[PDB]
Structures are given as C-alpha cells and as structure tokens.
Amino acid sequence: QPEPDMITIFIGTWNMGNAPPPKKITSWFLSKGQGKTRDDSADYIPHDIYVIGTQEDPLSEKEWLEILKHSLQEITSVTFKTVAIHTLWNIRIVVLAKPEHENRISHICTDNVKTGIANTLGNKGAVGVSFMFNGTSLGFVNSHLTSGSEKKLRRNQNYMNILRFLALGDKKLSPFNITHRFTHLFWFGDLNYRVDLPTWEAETIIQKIKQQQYADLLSHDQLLTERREQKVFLHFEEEEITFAPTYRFERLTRDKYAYTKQKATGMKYNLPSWCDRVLWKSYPLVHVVCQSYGSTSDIMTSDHSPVFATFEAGVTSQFVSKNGPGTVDSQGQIEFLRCYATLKTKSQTKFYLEFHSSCLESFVKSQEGENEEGSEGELVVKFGETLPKLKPIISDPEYLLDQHILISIKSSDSDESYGEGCIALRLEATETQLPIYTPLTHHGELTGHFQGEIKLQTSQ
C-alpha cells in the first residue's frame, strides 16, 4: 500500500443561526450549488479529510457527529473516523478522515481563543485543530469574528488575537505562531466582513445579486479591501468568489435577503455580504490547488448559507534512512551566503537568528549579525558568510528538497522574536548558490525581510 503524495481536503463553514439543520445536507459535502462547484463525476469519490466549522451551532457534539457521519456514509458508503472535535460556546470544529488514514494521522491538537474583554468577551472567538498527516503538518481554524458593518477593525483585532494565542502544532516551534507552524493552514468561519456600500443601496445590491453581477459588490467587500491594504490575513490566499452573498437570508427560502434594521439586529442593517469564507496559507512551493469554492442553494434553516471549499494538498511520507532519524547524515548540508535581515524596528539591540526545521535534530542559533543603517532609514542586520552550516538528519534529495527552514530573528537583549519567516528547500539546483527570500512577520504583521543565498548539498 503506497503512501500518498496528494490528498483532497474538504473545508465547510456554516453559521447555523441557532437552528437544527434540515434532514439532508449532502449538497454541502458534494460542493453543489453556486460558485466553483465539483464535477458530478466525482460525487462518489470521498475526500481524504473533511473539516466542518460551524457557528451558532445549537447541537450537542454527539448530535452533530451523528448527522455528519451518516451524511458522508450516504454519499460515499465509507464510515469516516473522528480525528477531533472541539467546541467553544456555539463555535465548533469537526475533523473526519477515511479509515485508511487512521495510522497516518498523529499529534492531534485542539485549542480555542475567546476574543474581546468584558462586554465583548462571551460569544466570539475561534476553535482549531492540528495534526501530522505522515510527514505533513496540517492546521485548521474555525473563527466567528465580531459582527456589524462598522466593526471591520474589531474583526482585524480578533484575527490577530486568534493567531497569537491559538496553541496548535509543535510547541518546540516557540518563536512561531500558527501562521508558520503548518505545511498547510486553512482558516475559515463566519469572518463577518461586509459589503461596505450605503444602506440606501440595499435594493440595488439585491438587483446586482439577482443578475449574478458580483464585481461592483466584491470591490467593496471589507475582507478583500482590508487584505489589499495589508490590515488582515497577510500572506493568506482566497479563491475568487463566484457565488451570491451567503448572508443575510430569510429562513426557509433563498429567494429573499433580510437586510432591514430590526430590534433583533440591534437596529443594524445587514446588507447582503460574504460573511462566510475559506482562506489558506501553505509553505512556499508546496502543491495546494482550490478545486471548489461555493455555497449551497438547498439548505435554508439558517439566515446563512453553508460554504464549501475543496483542495488538492501535497503531502510527504514519514522518511526513514540508515542514518536519520536518530543521527545526522554527513552527505547533507545547508549553507547560507551573503544573508541579511532588513527590519522595520526603530530599536538598537543586537540580533541573532534561529533556524527551526523537522530536517534538523534541533533548532540552531546563529552568532549575532552586524547592524548597519539602510539608505531609507531601515535597520539592516548583516550575517555575511557567518551563518552556521545546518546538518540535516537525512541527505536523500527526495526528502530534503521537500523540507522548509523557519527563521526567527531575535533580540540578544530580550530573546524576543522581531520577525518570523520560511524558506523552501525546493531549489532549482543543488551544490549551487541560489537566491532565497522570505518576508518577516511578528503577530502576523510585516516587520522586515530576510534575503541572501543558499547552497544545498544532498546525497545526489
């Protein structure tokens, strides 16, 4: 039985509006409705992993697992295994996998973050799950962010709190938040970003939706506009949206958007919006292709429609050689030439680097770099040819070229990371000096850059 080099992942997000689901929700798992939909010829082909995020979920874990497993069984005739389930208030994540994957999945982690203080702490936040699938780390975040058209900044703040404080993945990666811990990170939920147009334009918006003319609406979608101004979700991707706004519907039909202010909305308008979203971030030069992104048309118990997205994701095998794991492979080395960090910090401390990778027995600390002043005000930290030679556990190029090196630049004075990034070893050549580059972030905000050259030696 060969180990896979690709899997398919289903991501679902549904705000259930505190109502039980209808008797049939199979269209969700089949990626059928509006948008980028899945070919009918694939309907019986199970995805490898199904990750279901709900918000305003009124069901017990048991009740929802029942419905999910029986839905997938009906579609695929496969009885899925429960990998993980985690609930914060009415925010829930379920991970199901094909039974053949049970012994490929390990290191399962779950966590939650509650957003806001006092007033604003009590129902919003995120749940998440991570695990290893053979040699590949996978993370999944389901967030329900702050509601309301005039709270996009609160949503951005909720995002930064979730990525700082959600404790998933390898705890040995101590300088790195969830946006660097995983080969593939999927972040979905009722993100609650709105179409920012005047209230008086509600009927115009509805008209545009009926004509399937989304362009003048997406140009005002707060998540796209905040992303474009680097205010949120820096270095995440989203597939093009080709489905109608998924909020706010009258229940039991999809023929009507309910946008007018009511006591029940706190006298707020809910103009039709793409509240319900799926984004991802994968390490550089790893295969990840979105194969569906849309909304169902036939599930109408909630004022939201379910959203689906599916992905092809590259995975690697759990590599064993004669040497590592348990020792180094002298035939392998990673060298860095002419490297420097460019930092936005106004501070003057010395900096050193940390290299972290599962291709190393443990993380590697560099000597301090030499600070110089950039021509436009910047701090430039020069490492020249001074960076250590990294000694991987396995030299086989079929392993080593699939790996990644996480870099943290840390203050000598405080040992706090000022910036984190990631370098792919999927090089055009071995034994050859080649440019490398990563942006550096801290709390998911841009803090600088790291660039230089790499020289990778493999056994070939």
| Contacting residues toward ligand WK4, per CB under 6 A | 224, 227-228, 237
Residue 14 or 243: the one with the smaller Cβ distance to ligand WK4 is 243
Strands annotated E in 121-169: 125-133, 136-144
Nearest approach in angstroms of CB 357 to ligand WK4 is: 25
- Residue 237 tokens read as 């991707």
Residue 224 or 288: the one with the smaller Cβ distance to ligand WK4 is 224
Nearest approach in angstroms of CB 239 to ligand WK4 is: 10
Dihedral of the CA atoms 248, 250, 256, 258 (nearest 10)?
-50
Residue 17 or 439: the one with the smaller Cβ distance to ligand WK4 is 439
Nearest approach in angstroms of CB 183 to ligand WK4 is: 18
- Tell me whether residue 400 is exposed, middle or buried, using C-beta atoms within 10 angstroms of its C-beta: 0 to 12, 13 to 18, 19 or more: buried
Provide the 10 A C-beta neighbour count for residue 167: 15
Which residues are registered as beta bridge partners of 127?
112, 142
Residue 171 or 228: the one with the smaller Cβ distance to ligand WK4 is 228
3-state secondary structure of 80: coil
Nearest approach in angstroms of CB 110 to ligand WK4 is: 29
Residue 83 or 313: the one with the smaller Cβ distance to ligand WK4 is 313
Residue 218 or 380: the one with the smaller Cβ distance to ligand WK4 is 218
Nearest approach in angstroms of CB 422 to ligand WK4 is: 16
Nearest approach in angstroms of CB 237 to ligand WK4 is: 5
Instruction: Identify which of 395, 392, 458 has the alpha carbon closest to the alpha carbon of residue 429.
Output: 458
Phi and psi at residue 225, to the nearest 5°: -70, -40
Nearest approach in angstroms of CB 456 to ligand WK4 is: 27
Within 8 A by CB and 6+ apart from 247, the residues are 15, 190, 270, 272, 273, 274, 275, 276, 303, 304, 305
Single-letter amino acid code for the residue at 293: Y
Residue 23 or 228: the one with the smaller Cβ distance to ligand WK4 is 228
3-state secondary structure of 237: strand
